[PDB]
Design a protein around this ligand. Sequence first.
Ligand code: DXC
Ligand code: PR
Length: 387
Amino acid sequence: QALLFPLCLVLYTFSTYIGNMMIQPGMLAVVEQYQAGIDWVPTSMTAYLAGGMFLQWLLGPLSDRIGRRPVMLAGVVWFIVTCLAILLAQNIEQFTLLRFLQGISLCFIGAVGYAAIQESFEEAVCIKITALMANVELIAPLLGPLVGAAWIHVLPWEGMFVLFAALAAISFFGLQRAMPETATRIGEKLSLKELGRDYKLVLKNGRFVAGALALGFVSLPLLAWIAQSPIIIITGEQLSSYEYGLLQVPIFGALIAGNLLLARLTSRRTVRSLIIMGGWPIMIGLLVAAAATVISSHAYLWMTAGLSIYAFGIGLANAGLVRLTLFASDMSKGTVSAAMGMLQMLIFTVGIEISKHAWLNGGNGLFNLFNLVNGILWLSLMVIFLK
Ligand SMILES: C[C@H](CCC(=O)O)[C@H]1CC[C@H]2[C@@H]3CC[C@@H]4C[C@H](O)CC[C@]4(C)[C@H]3C[C@H](O)[C@]12C
Ligand SMILES: [Pr+3]
């Protein structure tokens, strides 16, 4: 009867992902209008990222302290505002500022949004909702740059920011009068000292952190492409919106097929085995991605095909290693998730930044090498983590 409330959060999750996944393809348009350089294409994703790990930590224990409903809305409100208040910045120096504050609307999905379902809805109820909100994080980056390439053709870029402010409103007016709250730390002290100390505790966990990083490092060459897959292909390799949007699928359609097997071979194998099971393709992915652009700088096909191996493997291994890293520290779910959030993004954010220049002054070589760097890193934190 009240299954309309999860779907509203489902929608809010949907919008925030495409809000980044339809934007990176049509960032060129926005660069060739605001005028700075194609080096500011990925640096969209980057400031969108670096917002998420601002109050990531503080929003969880915060949505606890003063209700879940008014903080969640301060986020849905905070999204639609900067979804239309960025259309009136018009310069690239402060497009960042409004892109960045659109990235803080990311803490709200997990640290309070996800937490509202873990509080109210019960186990088997929560399962199908999370099985849903894991496909949102899979379909909205899969098909988002495909609508984001059929949107810049029939309309301008601006049509997106209206469509998101509106879809976040279809959810927001569905949450205006249909959002019950379950925060139990009402009327509690402004205890800020306790967080840093207790996050430092999970920070002390040389099995968890080294395992939290290795989640970052592994899933980065995935995000470093997404942020640069436009100006790698459109301007870099000089291909159209149908040809570049064609290369998004062999990658993604390989990640989906690695999340097909995972949930199927979750049974016949151990979690411990799956990470090493899905690790060989990842190793062979970034092995052959950059073992392509060796002498042949511009055989993007074999790079994208190499990011189809690597991508299949992220479906399986990376997803497994999530849990074990949660349970690598026998501590609170809220503190660990936030701690591995704020660690994965710092790998993502500043990982791309280096990943950017990796592409400039080197081209395609250096970039893919500063990919296999990360497969090396993750692997090098697997010889630690299991054996
Ligand atoms: C739980 C956070 C939400 C907090 C945040 O905004 O970062 C989300 C955001 C990004 C998510 C990850 C994206 C990459 C991965 C894709 C895999 O095929 C399935 C597991 C992974 C590892 C995901 C697991 C998890 O669902 C994450 C870490
Ligand atoms: Pr505590």
